Short mmCIF file of C-alpha atoms and ligand atoms in Angstrom, two decimals:
data_model
loop_
_atom_site.label_atom_id
_atom_site.label_comp_id
_atom_site.label_asym_id
_atom_site.label_seq_id
_atom_site.Cartn_x
_atom_site.Cartn_y
_atom_site.Cartn_z
CA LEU Y 1 108.48 -96.50 84.25
CA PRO Y 2 107.10 -97.15 87.55
CA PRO Y 3 107.04 -100.49 89.53
CA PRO Y 4 103.57 -102.67 89.55
CA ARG Y 5 100.89 -101.44 91.55
CA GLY Y 6 98.90 -103.90 93.81
CA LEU Y 7 101.73 -106.00 94.68
CA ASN Y 8 100.73 -109.01 96.91
CA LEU Y 9 102.87 -112.06 97.97
CA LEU Y 10 101.07 -115.17 99.45
CA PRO Y 11 102.27 -118.39 100.27
CA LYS Y 12 100.54 -121.30 98.12
CA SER Y 13 102.42 -124.22 99.40
CA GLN Y 14 105.50 -125.61 101.26
CA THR Y 15 107.82 -124.91 98.30
CA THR Y 16 106.05 -122.19 96.25
CA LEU Y 17 105.08 -118.69 96.54
CA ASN Y 18 102.54 -116.71 94.52
CA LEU Y 19 103.39 -112.93 93.79
CA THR Y 20 100.37 -110.96 91.97
CA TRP Y 21 99.90 -107.20 90.59
CA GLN Y 22 97.44 -105.02 88.92
CA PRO Y 23 97.65 -105.33 85.23
CA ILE Y 24 100.48 -102.74 83.87
CA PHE Y 25 98.95 -99.92 81.58
CA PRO Y 26 100.94 -99.50 78.06
CA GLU Y 27 103.85 -97.32 74.48
CA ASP Y 28 105.76 -100.15 73.98
CA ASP Y 29 107.60 -102.75 74.81
CA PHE Y 30 108.16 -104.08 78.31
CA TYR Y 31 108.36 -106.89 80.80
CA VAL Y 32 108.46 -107.38 84.54
CA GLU Y 33 111.69 -108.16 86.53
CA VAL Y 34 110.73 -110.43 89.59
CA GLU Y 35 113.65 -110.90 92.52
CA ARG Y 36 113.38 -113.19 95.29
CA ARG Y 37 115.72 -113.96 97.81
CA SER Y 38 116.04 -116.09 100.76
CA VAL Y 39 116.66 -114.92 104.29
CA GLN Y 40 117.83 -117.97 105.99
CA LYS Y 41 119.94 -118.83 103.31
CA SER Y 42 122.09 -117.16 100.49
CA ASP Y 43 119.78 -117.73 97.62
CA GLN Y 44 118.51 -114.96 94.93
CA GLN Y 45 116.71 -116.33 91.69
CA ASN Y 46 115.62 -113.36 89.08
CA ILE Y 47 112.79 -114.24 86.93
CA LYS Y 48 111.51 -112.06 83.77
CA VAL Y 49 107.98 -112.14 82.73
CA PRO Y 50 105.99 -110.69 79.96
CA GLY Y 51 104.44 -107.61 80.81
CA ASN Y 52 100.58 -108.33 79.87
CA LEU Y 53 100.38 -111.42 82.69
CA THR Y 54 99.26 -110.36 85.75
CA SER Y 55 101.59 -112.79 88.33
CA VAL Y 56 103.93 -115.29 88.91
CA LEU Y 57 104.53 -118.37 90.81
CA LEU Y 58 107.95 -118.66 92.45
CA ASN Y 59 108.80 -122.26 93.04
CA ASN Y 60 111.54 -124.77 94.14
CA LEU Y 61 111.60 -123.18 97.80
CA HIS Y 62 112.63 -124.48 100.83
CA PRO Y 63 109.97 -125.04 103.65
CA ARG Y 64 109.36 -123.04 106.54
CA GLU Y 65 111.57 -120.42 105.25
CA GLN Y 66 110.92 -116.69 104.44
CA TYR Y 67 111.72 -114.78 101.48
CA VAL Y 68 111.91 -111.32 100.44
CA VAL Y 69 110.99 -110.19 96.95
CA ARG Y 70 110.49 -107.03 94.91
CA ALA Y 71 109.52 -106.20 91.13
CA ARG Y 72 109.82 -103.25 88.37
CA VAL Y 73 109.24 -103.10 84.59
CA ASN Y 74 112.09 -102.54 82.40
CA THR Y 75 111.71 -101.24 78.74
CA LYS Y 76 114.52 -100.54 77.38
CA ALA Y 77 114.74 -98.16 80.44
CA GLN Y 78 115.52 -99.75 83.90
CA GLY Y 79 112.50 -98.75 85.96
CA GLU Y 80 112.84 -98.37 89.80
CA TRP Y 81 112.16 -101.09 91.89
CA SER Y 82 109.00 -101.70 94.11
CA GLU Y 83 108.95 -101.78 98.14
CA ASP Y 84 109.94 -105.39 99.55
CA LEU Y 85 107.33 -107.61 100.32
CA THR Y 86 108.04 -110.59 102.41
CA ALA Y 87 106.37 -113.84 103.15
CA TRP Y 88 107.11 -117.46 104.49
CA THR Y 89 106.45 -120.57 102.86
CA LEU Y 90 104.05 -123.00 104.37
CA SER Y 91 105.66 -125.64 107.49
CA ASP Y 92 106.62 -129.00 106.74
CA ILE Y 93 106.47 -129.75 110.61
CA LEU Y 94 103.99 -129.31 113.31
CA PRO Y 95 104.06 -125.77 115.07
CA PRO Y 96 105.51 -124.96 118.43
CA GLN Y 97 103.58 -124.46 121.44
CA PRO Y 98 102.86 -120.85 122.37
CA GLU Y 99 105.66 -119.51 125.13
CA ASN Y 100 105.15 -116.81 127.87
CA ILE Y 101 101.52 -118.09 128.59
CA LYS Y 102 100.59 -115.36 131.42
CA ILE Y 103 97.09 -116.32 133.52
CA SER Y 104 96.50 -112.69 135.23
CA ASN Y 105 93.82 -110.32 136.05
CA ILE Y 106 91.97 -113.05 138.13
CA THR Y 107 88.12 -112.27 139.23
CA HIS Y 108 84.97 -113.84 140.02
CA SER Y 109 83.78 -114.42 136.66
CA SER Y 110 86.69 -113.50 134.31
CA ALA Y 111 90.69 -113.42 133.57
CA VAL Y 112 92.99 -112.38 130.97
CA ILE Y 113 95.43 -114.93 129.04
CA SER Y 114 98.35 -113.55 127.23
CA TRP Y 115 100.83 -115.59 125.19
CA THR Y 116 103.52 -115.31 122.52
CA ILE Y 117 103.70 -117.15 119.03
CA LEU Y 118 107.09 -117.79 117.58
CA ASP Y 119 107.06 -116.44 113.65
CA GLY Y 120 108.10 -118.93 111.07
CA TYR Y 121 105.71 -121.72 111.14
CA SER Y 122 102.70 -120.45 109.20
CA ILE Y 123 100.39 -119.92 112.41
CA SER Y 124 97.09 -118.95 110.92
CA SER Y 125 94.99 -119.45 114.32
CA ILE Y 126 95.54 -119.86 118.20
CA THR Y 127 92.78 -122.09 120.32
CA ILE Y 128 92.12 -121.35 124.17
CA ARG Y 129 90.48 -124.31 125.50
CA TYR Y 130 89.11 -123.85 128.78
CA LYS Y 131 87.11 -126.51 131.11
CA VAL Y 132 86.03 -127.22 134.96
CA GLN Y 133 89.05 -129.11 136.37
CA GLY Y 134 86.73 -132.15 138.08
CA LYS Y 135 87.09 -135.53 136.83
CA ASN Y 136 83.87 -135.67 134.91
CA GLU Y 137 84.61 -133.35 132.18
CA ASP Y 138 81.19 -133.38 130.23
CA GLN Y 139 81.97 -129.84 128.24
CA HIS Y 140 84.58 -127.67 127.48
CA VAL Y 141 85.08 -124.31 125.60
CA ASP Y 142 87.21 -123.58 122.85
CA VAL Y 143 88.00 -119.64 121.97
CA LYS Y 144 89.29 -119.76 118.44
CA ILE Y 145 91.00 -116.82 117.39
CA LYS Y 146 91.58 -116.43 113.90
CA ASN Y 147 94.15 -113.88 113.44
CA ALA Y 148 97.32 -114.44 114.59
CA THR Y 149 98.44 -110.92 115.52
CA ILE Y 150 96.06 -111.27 118.74
CA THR Y 151 98.48 -111.80 121.53
CA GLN Y 152 96.09 -111.51 124.35
CA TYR Y 153 92.53 -112.49 125.63
CA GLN Y 154 90.00 -111.88 128.27
CA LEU Y 155 87.94 -115.03 129.18
CA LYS Y 156 84.27 -114.06 130.66
CA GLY Y 157 81.51 -115.77 132.52
CA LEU Y 158 83.20 -117.95 134.46
CA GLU Y 159 81.87 -119.35 137.86
CA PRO Y 160 83.29 -118.14 141.27
CA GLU Y 161 85.09 -120.69 143.44
CA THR Y 162 85.73 -122.93 140.83
CA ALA Y 163 89.08 -124.18 139.50
CA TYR Y 164 89.52 -124.51 135.60
CA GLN Y 165 92.02 -126.26 133.50
CA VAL Y 166 93.26 -123.78 130.51
CA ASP Y 167 95.15 -125.11 127.46
CA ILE Y 168 96.24 -123.13 124.51
CA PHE Y 169 96.90 -124.60 120.77
CA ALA Y 170 98.48 -122.57 118.11
CA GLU Y 171 97.45 -124.00 114.42
CA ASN Y 172 99.32 -123.88 111.27
CA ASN Y 173 98.94 -125.79 107.79
CA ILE Y 174 100.11 -128.96 109.10
CA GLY Y 175 97.96 -129.07 112.58
CA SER Y 176 97.63 -127.90 115.90
CA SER Y 177 100.61 -127.56 118.20
CA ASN Y 178 100.99 -130.49 121.53
CA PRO Y 179 101.03 -129.07 124.62
CA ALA Y 180 103.16 -130.80 127.29
CA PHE Y 181 101.36 -129.30 129.99
CA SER Y 182 98.02 -127.54 130.77
CA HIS Y 183 97.66 -124.20 133.23
CA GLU Y 184 95.50 -123.80 136.39
CA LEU Y 185 92.94 -120.96 136.93
CA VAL Y 186 90.97 -120.56 140.31
CA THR Y 187 88.09 -117.73 140.41
CA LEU Y 188 86.95 -115.83 143.80
CA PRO Y 189 83.64 -114.01 144.42
CA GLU Y 190 84.81 -113.19 147.39
CA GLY S 1 68.67 -174.34 133.60
CA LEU S 2 71.41 -172.23 134.07
CA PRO S 3 71.46 -168.37 134.61
CA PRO S 4 73.15 -166.23 131.91
CA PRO S 5 76.30 -164.31 131.88
CA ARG S 6 76.88 -161.71 134.13
CA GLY S 7 78.24 -158.11 133.12
CA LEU S 8 76.68 -158.09 130.00
CA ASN S 9 77.97 -155.01 127.70
CA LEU S 10 76.59 -153.83 124.04
CA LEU S 11 79.17 -151.81 122.42
CA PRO S 12 78.89 -150.35 118.92
CA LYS S 13 82.30 -150.89 117.26
CA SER S 14 81.33 -149.74 113.39
CA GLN S 15 78.64 -149.80 110.92
CA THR S 16 78.17 -153.08 110.42
CA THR S 17 79.55 -154.42 114.07
CA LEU S 18 78.45 -154.46 117.80
CA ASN S 19 80.70 -156.12 120.40
CA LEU S 20 79.16 -158.04 123.22
CA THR S 21 81.39 -158.31 126.16
CA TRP S 22 80.45 -160.30 129.46
CA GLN S 23 82.33 -161.99 132.81
CA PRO S 24 83.51 -165.30 132.18
CA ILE S 25 82.67 -168.36 133.79
CA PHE S 26 84.09 -171.77 133.92
CA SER S 27 79.21 -178.39 136.61
CA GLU S 28 80.78 -181.08 134.04
CA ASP S 29 81.36 -179.82 130.42
CA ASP S 30 80.23 -179.11 127.91
CA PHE S 31 79.11 -175.68 127.55
CA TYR S 32 78.75 -172.63 125.24
CA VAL S 33 77.16 -169.24 125.22
CA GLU S 34 74.07 -168.69 122.51
CA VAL S 35 73.78 -165.13 121.55
CA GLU S 36 70.68 -164.06 119.88
CA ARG S 37 70.83 -160.62 117.87
CA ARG S 38 67.56 -159.38 115.81
CA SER S 39 67.08 -155.96 113.78
CA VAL S 40 64.58 -153.43 114.97
CA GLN S 41 63.93 -151.90 111.69
CA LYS S 42 64.48 -154.75 109.40
CA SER S 43 63.35 -158.14 109.92
CA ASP S 44 67.00 -159.66 110.27
CA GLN S 45 67.77 -162.27 113.41
CA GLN S 46 70.73 -164.52 113.79
CA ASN S 47 71.59 -167.15 116.28
CA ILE S 48 75.26 -167.44 117.03
CA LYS S 49 76.96 -170.32 119.27
CA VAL S 50 80.46 -169.46 120.73
CA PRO S 51 82.39 -171.81 123.28
CA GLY S 52 81.78 -171.05 126.77
CA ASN S 53 85.55 -170.33 127.39
CA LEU S 54 85.62 -166.98 125.70
CA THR S 55 84.72 -163.39 127.13
CA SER S 56 83.28 -161.66 123.86
CA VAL S 57 81.77 -162.03 120.53
CA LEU S 58 81.63 -159.52 117.48
CA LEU S 59 78.44 -159.28 116.02
CA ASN S 60 79.13 -158.71 112.30
CA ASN S 61 77.11 -158.36 109.03
CA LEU S 62 74.74 -155.94 110.36
CA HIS S 63 73.44 -152.79 108.31
CA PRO S 64 74.32 -148.67 108.94
CA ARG S 65 72.42 -146.59 111.66
CA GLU S 66 70.28 -149.85 112.54
CA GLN S 67 68.89 -150.67 115.77
CA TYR S 68 69.51 -154.01 117.39
CA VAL S 69 67.97 -155.81 120.34
CA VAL S 70 70.54 -158.46 121.79
CA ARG S 71 70.11 -161.42 124.56
CA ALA S 72 72.55 -164.62 125.55
CA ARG S 73 72.40 -167.65 127.70
CA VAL S 74 74.54 -170.54 128.72
CA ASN S 75 73.42 -174.07 127.50
CA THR S 76 74.51 -177.64 128.11
CA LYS S 77 72.53 -180.61 128.19
CA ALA S 78 69.58 -178.26 129.39
CA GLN S 79 69.14 -174.98 127.90
CA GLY S 80 69.79 -171.96 130.00
CA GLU S 81 67.70 -168.81 131.58
CA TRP S 82 67.78 -165.97 128.88
CA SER S 83 69.57 -162.67 129.93
CA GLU S 84 67.80 -159.15 129.83
CA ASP S 85 67.51 -157.36 126.44
CA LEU S 86 70.95 -155.44 125.69
CA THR S 87 70.17 -152.82 122.83
CA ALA S 88 72.36 -150.75 120.71
CA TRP S 89 72.51 -148.68 117.37
CA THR S 90 75.31 -149.56 114.83
CA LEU S 91 77.46 -146.59 113.79
CA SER S 92 76.00 -144.20 110.95
CA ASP S 93 77.06 -144.04 107.57
CA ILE S 94 75.34 -140.49 107.17
CA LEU S 95 75.78 -136.96 108.80
CA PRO S 96 73.36 -136.01 111.43
CA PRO S 97 70.30 -133.98 111.12
CA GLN S 98 70.35 -130.43 112.66
CA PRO S 99 68.88 -129.85 116.10
CA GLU S 100 65.48 -128.98 116.43
CA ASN S 101 63.29 -127.16 119.30
CA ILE S 102 66.15 -124.37 119.24
CA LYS S 103 64.31 -122.13 122.08
CA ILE S 104 66.57 -119.54 123.18
CA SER S 105 65.65 -117.67 126.50
CA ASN S 106 66.38 -116.07 129.45
CA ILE S 107 68.23 -113.40 127.63
CA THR S 108 70.28 -110.95 130.10
CA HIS S 109 72.78 -108.49 129.80
CA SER S 110 75.31 -111.16 129.85
CA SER S 111 73.29 -114.50 129.87
CA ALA S 112 71.52 -116.35 127.39
CA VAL S 113 70.27 -119.90 128.09
CA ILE S 114 69.74 -122.43 124.92
CA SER S 115 67.62 -125.58 124.66
CA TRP S 116 67.77 -127.88 121.73
CA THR S 117 66.94 -131.16 120.86
CA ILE S 118 68.31 -134.26 118.74
CA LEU S 119 67.12 -137.29 116.65
CA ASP S 120 68.29 -140.58 118.37
CA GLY S 121 69.69 -143.17 115.92
CA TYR S 122 72.71 -141.57 114.52
CA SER S 123 75.42 -142.13 116.94
CA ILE S 124 75.61 -138.47 117.82
CA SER S 125 78.33 -138.39 120.24
CA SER S 126 78.41 -134.48 120.95
CA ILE S 127 77.12 -131.16 119.96
CA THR S 128 78.76 -128.04 119.50
CA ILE S 129 77.29 -124.58 120.19
CA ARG S 130 78.96 -121.88 118.11
CA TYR S 131 78.58 -118.08 118.62
CA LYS S 132 80.55 -115.09 117.43
CA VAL S 133 79.52 -111.13 116.85
CA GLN S 134 77.06 -109.95 114.33
CA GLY S 135 79.70 -108.33 112.13
CA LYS S 136 81.74 -110.35 109.58
CA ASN S 137 84.86 -109.77 110.86
CA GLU S 138 86.43 -113.17 111.17
CA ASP S 139 88.73 -112.57 114.07
CA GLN S 140 87.01 -114.53 116.98
CA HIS S 141 84.48 -117.09 117.69
CA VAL S 142 83.48 -119.25 120.87
CA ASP S 143 82.95 -123.15 120.17
CA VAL S 144 81.34 -124.76 123.28
CA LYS S 145 81.88 -128.48 123.03
CA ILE S 146 79.32 -130.70 124.74
CA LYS S 147 80.55 -134.13 125.12
CA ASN S 148 77.26 -136.22 125.83
CA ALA S 149 74.02 -136.35 124.01
CA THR S 150 72.20 -136.49 127.35
CA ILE S 151 72.60 -132.92 127.99
CA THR S 152 69.85 -130.97 126.32
CA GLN S 153 70.24 -127.23 127.73
CA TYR S 154 73.28 -124.68 127.86
CA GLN S 155 73.59 -121.25 129.56
CA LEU S 156 75.80 -118.94 127.81
CA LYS S 157 77.49 -116.70 130.02
CA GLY S 158 80.06 -113.12 130.23
CA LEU S 159 78.37 -111.75 126.89
CA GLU S 160 78.74 -108.23 126.23
CA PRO S 161 75.68 -106.10 126.78
CA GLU S 162 73.53 -104.65 123.97
CA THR S 163 75.12 -106.82 121.46
CA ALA S 164 74.02 -109.12 118.47
CA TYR S 165 75.23 -112.73 118.60
CA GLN S 166 75.47 -115.24 115.40
CA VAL S 167 74.76 -118.57 117.12
CA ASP S 168 75.28 -121.65 115.50
CA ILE S 169 74.48 -125.09 116.76
CA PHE S 170 76.65 -128.17 115.37
CA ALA S 171 75.67 -132.15 116.09
CA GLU S 172 78.61 -134.56 115.88
CA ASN S 173 78.95 -138.09 114.96
CA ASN S 174 81.40 -140.98 113.85
CA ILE S 175 81.04 -139.35 109.88
CA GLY S 176 80.89 -135.74 110.69
CA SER S 177 79.05 -132.53 111.95
CA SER S 178 75.38 -131.59 110.82
CA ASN S 179 74.83 -129.07 108.43
CA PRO S 180 72.98 -125.73 109.46
CA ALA S 181 70.70 -124.28 107.04
CA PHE S 182 70.31 -121.33 109.11
CA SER S 183 71.75 -119.52 112.14
CA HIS S 184 69.91 -117.66 114.86
CA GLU S 185 70.19 -114.17 116.29
CA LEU S 186 70.67 -113.33 119.91
CA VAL S 187 70.23 -109.68 121.39
CA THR S 188 71.45 -108.59 124.47
CA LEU S 189 70.34 -106.06 127.07
CA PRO S 190 71.45 -103.24 129.33
CA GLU S 191 73.07 -102.92 131.68
C1 LIG W 201 98.44 -116.77 91.60
O1 LIG W 201 97.73 -115.81 92.15
C2 LIG W 201 96.05 -115.71 91.64
C3 LIG W 201 95.34 -116.87 92.92
O2 LIG W 201 96.42 -116.59 94.30
C4 LIG W 201 95.61 -116.44 90.43
O3 LIG W 201 94.84 -115.68 89.83
C5 LIG W 201 93.61 -116.15 89.44
O4 LIG W 201 93.71 -117.44 88.22
C6 LIG W 201 92.83 -117.89 87.38
C7 LIG W 201 92.68 -117.22 86.36
O5 LIG W 201 93.48 -117.99 85.11
C8 LIG W 201 91.51 -117.78 88.40
O6 LIG W 201 91.57 -118.95 89.54
C9 LIG W 201 91.12 -116.56 89.23
O7 LIG W 201 90.08 -115.78 88.10
C10 LIG W 201 90.20 -115.74 86.91
O8 LIG W 201 89.96 -114.05 86.42
C11 LIG W 201 88.68 -114.10 86.64
C12 LIG W 201 88.14 -114.00 88.23
O9 LIG W 201 87.17 -112.93 88.08
C13 LIG W 201 87.80 -115.14 86.03
O10 LIG W 201 86.99 -114.49 84.96
C14 LIG W 201 88.61 -116.03 85.30
O11 LIG W 201 87.70 -116.99 84.56
C15 LIG W 201 89.86 -116.75 86.07
O12 LIG W 201 89.27 -117.62 86.72
C16 LIG W 201 92.24 -115.33 88.86
N1 LIG W 201 92.05 -114.74 90.10
C17 LIG W 201 92.94 -113.54 90.01
C18 LIG W 201 92.15 -112.28 90.89
O13 LIG W 201 93.44 -112.84 88.94
C19 LIG W 201 96.54 -117.22 89.96
O14 LIG W 201 96.40 -117.90 88.80
C20 LIG W 201 97.80 -117.83 90.77
N2 LIG W 201 98.54 -118.93 90.06
C21 LIG W 201 99.44 -118.43 89.30
C22 LIG W 201 100.47 -119.25 88.58
O15 LIG W 201 99.89 -117.33 88.57
C1 LIG W 202 85.20 -156.37 122.07
O1 LIG W 202 85.26 -156.06 123.28
C2 LIG W 202 86.04 -155.99 124.24
C3 LIG W 202 86.29 -154.95 125.29
O2 LIG W 202 86.69 -153.73 124.26
C4 LIG W 202 87.97 -156.56 123.67
O3 LIG W 202 88.39 -157.13 125.06
C5 LIG W 202 89.80 -156.65 124.99
O4 LIG W 202 90.84 -157.46 124.44
C6 LIG W 202 91.83 -156.80 124.38
C7 LIG W 202 93.22 -158.23 124.01
O5 LIG W 202 92.70 -158.66 122.77
C8 LIG W 202 92.49 -156.31 125.57
O6 LIG W 202 92.08 -154.65 125.44
C9 LIG W 202 91.62 -156.77 126.82
O7 LIG W 202 91.99 -158.19 127.48
C10 LIG W 202 90.08 -156.56 126.66
N1 LIG W 202 89.30 -155.53 127.08
C11 LIG W 202 88.53 -155.46 128.18
C12 LIG W 202 88.06 -154.13 128.79
O8 LIG W 202 88.01 -156.79 128.90
C13 LIG W 202 87.61 -157.40 122.66
O9 LIG W 202 88.93 -158.03 122.12
C14 LIG W 202 86.72 -156.97 121.65
N2 LIG W 202 86.64 -157.69 120.50
C15 LIG W 202 86.19 -159.23 120.51
C16 LIG W 202 86.53 -159.59 118.80
O10 LIG W 202 86.00 -159.92 121.37
C1 NAG W 203 100.77 -111.66 75.77
O1 NAG W 203 101.45 -111.59 74.69
C2 NAG W 203 101.72 -112.87 74.17
C3 NAG W 203 102.05 -112.24 72.58
O2 NAG W 203 102.27 -113.60 71.80
C4 NAG W 203 100.59 -113.43 73.77
O3 NAG W 203 100.83 -114.77 73.36
C5 NAG W 203 99.62 -113.93 75.06
O4 NAG W 203 98.31 -114.34 75.19
C6 NAG W 203 99.17 -112.36 75.94
N1 NAG W 203 98.58 -112.35 77.13
C7 NAG W 203 97.37 -111.63 77.42
C8 NAG W 203 97.10 -110.81 76.19
O5 NAG W 203 96.92 -111.87 78.52
C1 NAG W 204 94.83 -105.95 134.70
O1 NAG W 204 96.04 -105.27 134.81
C2 NAG W 204 96.21 -104.54 133.83
C3 NAG W 204 97.76 -103.99 133.75
O2 NAG W 204 97.49 -103.24 135.38
C4 NAG W 204 95.13 -103.23 133.79
O3 NAG W 204 94.16 -103.54 132.60
C5 NAG W 204 94.19 -103.55 134.70
O4 NAG W 204 94.91 -102.66 136.20
C6 NAG W 204 93.74 -104.70 135.26
N1 NAG W 204 92.18 -104.93 134.58
C7 NAG W 204 91.11 -105.60 135.34
C8 NAG W 204 91.25 -106.07 136.74
O5 NAG W 204 90.02 -105.52 134.69
C1 NAG W 205 89.41 -172.13 125.28
O1 NAG W 205 89.47 -173.50 124.98
C2 NAG W 205 89.99 -174.12 123.56
C3 NAG W 205 89.92 -175.33 123.69
O2 NAG W 205 90.27 -175.80 122.30
C4 NAG W 205 91.17 -173.03 123.07
O3 NAG W 205 91.30 -173.34 121.90
C5 NAG W 205 91.32 -171.78 123.68
O4 NAG W 205 92.48 -171.36 123.68
C6 NAG W 205 90.83 -171.44 125.09
N1 NAG W 205 90.54 -170.24 125.51
C7 NAG W 205 91.32 -169.58 126.38
C8 NAG W 205 91.74 -170.30 127.80
O5 NAG W 205 91.17 -168.42 126.84
C1 NAG W 206 68.21 -116.82 134.02
O1 NAG W 206 69.62 -116.07 134.50
C2 NAG W 206 69.83 -116.00 135.94
C3 NAG W 206 71.21 -115.30 135.90
O2 NAG W 206 72.10 -115.66 134.86
C4 NAG W 206 69.81 -117.20 136.52
O3 NAG W 206 70.05 -117.06 138.04
C5 NAG W 206 68.34 -118.17 136.40
O4 NAG W 206 68.24 -119.21 137.01
C6 NAG W 206 68.06 -118.34 134.79
N1 NAG W 206 66.43 -118.33 134.76
C7 NAG W 206 66.02 -119.55 134.01
C8 NAG W 206 64.72 -119.70 134.06
O5 NAG W 206 66.72 -120.45 133.41
#
């Protein structure tokens, strides 16, 4: 038999992952073999679940640890395995600050910021906070980037000859990252 | 008649408290600070004696988002001159209302000024203007944070020409943000 279609692996907690698939079409009579397997440690479990149900909760997992998962259908006959799905369980700790922070392309009313995030901490978003560097500080701007794939952003409509303070936070299930230092940005008309 | 304490300041601490601080003082004894507070909305006035050698009273047993007028004096054998009125709202127990008078204007290819207005007495400490592209893609959005309720306008800058933005505008407060029933549309020009 062919493996389950529509296989999707999502982290629902710090110790649990949820594998879902599309309902299997029956003659008789079958079950779904699910194999999950840790990367950071040597830990494989193998679960049999009745064919008519559509998902399994994989539980008793460790925090911020990635697991590789595959599945199949057996009858009788041993079905061919699905492709390997991977996922991290949610973080137990606060996420690390984005590394390789590079401010460049500095213009009169714009600049480009680039960074790198470490995978493994369930970073769901990053925020780019920028404000005028003066001692007043009555307002700032948060650019909220909701997909952690994006590695770069261009700030726009900045004021010329102005010094800005720029910070970059990464947010996960626990909370935001804590920056030790900010970054400077000075525009030029010229 | 002695003059009142100097450097009088009234800070809202909680929903039921305000803190009145002043510059401490030290002829012959004894002396105490008479502090009066009174509700604007309700009819609730109280008179509090505190010994003259401490620097602050916490005026307690007040009601949520209620305005209060405060004054003070230094009494001895004779009663002193009253201070000027201090006024403050206690912190709110609800979310603030959405800002009315949302007038967008001066729309250019990369600029779009926005002005609003807020109702006082809700302890509104900041307002957030949010703006993203009209598309349903939840990739990016920009939260402009304005940390004083004094500021009434703001000019958006560096927007993309010929584009539709979905502007929201929240008001924040000791409980939480306001809840917009509706967003606002912003077209941009050529360029
Ligand atoms: C793992 O996977 C998903 C969530 O990530 C869960 O599937 C769902 O579970 C219940 C149904 O028992 C519901 O919350 C979801 O909707 C259900 O099916 C339809 C939805 O159209 C409704 O008519 C039902 O009333 C019912 O609510 C359901 N969602 C889907 C798409 O299947 C699953 O429970 C979760 N946990 C485990 C332990 O498997
Ligand atoms: C009322 O307000 C003032 C200022 O917030 C408080 O005075 C402070 O007291 C603590 C020590 O107990 C220190 O932070 C300083 O000595 C004071 N600060 C200043 C700025 O003077 C006061 O304690 C508050 N509460 C009461 C009940 O009086
Ligand atoms: C799967 O089959 C078993 C047979 O006992 C039944 O208990 C269960 O409700 C079935 N689930 C379905 C049809 O979703
Ligand atoms: C910024 O630098 C990169 C790499 O050279 C390139 O996109 C371009 O030269 C610059 N872009 C500007 C100034 O808009
Ligand atoms: C004020 O004087 C009284 C005298 O009973 C004393 O209890 C209190 O500690 C004094 N406060 C000071 C010196 O701050
Ligand atoms: C309109 O925008 C331009 C350029 O951004 C600015 O110079 C001008 O002051 C604005 N006009 C008003 C009436 O706000």
